[PDB]
Amino acid sequence: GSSGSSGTGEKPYKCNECGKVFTQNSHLARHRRVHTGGKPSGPSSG
Template sequence: ERPYRCPDCPKAFKNSSSLRRHRQLHTGERPHACPVCGKAFAQPSNLRQHQRVHTGERPYACPQCPKAFTHSSNLQLHRRTHAASRPHRCPLCPKTFVAASYLQRH
């Protein structure tokens, strides 16, 4: 059951804190500012991720090669490069890619 309903959209939540966090999307509230550059974020976790831009921290390391990433989603996308499946084929040359975005960039 999700008794906490957003008054601005159809979403509903199990607890009031989740609703409060969601409402920041509608209000534009960004109370968590980076002390280095001033960029502000709605969630403290997003600020922590952003701060890696300044520190150079890359905590998500690929177990198959030396590459490391600031975001887990970038590691997940990268790991596809080690996979055998490369379903996205360039119509102009023989190259194939693991992700459609890689083909578009090519």
């Protein structure tokens, strides 16, 4: 039944917001921004 899909995270740096991984820390610290500040798909604006 429930199998433990392997190959999920090969680095100590992982975003605790969405669930992503990075090879470095700077990439993780900067990535976080995508959350606090970001405009994903949505309605039409100007």
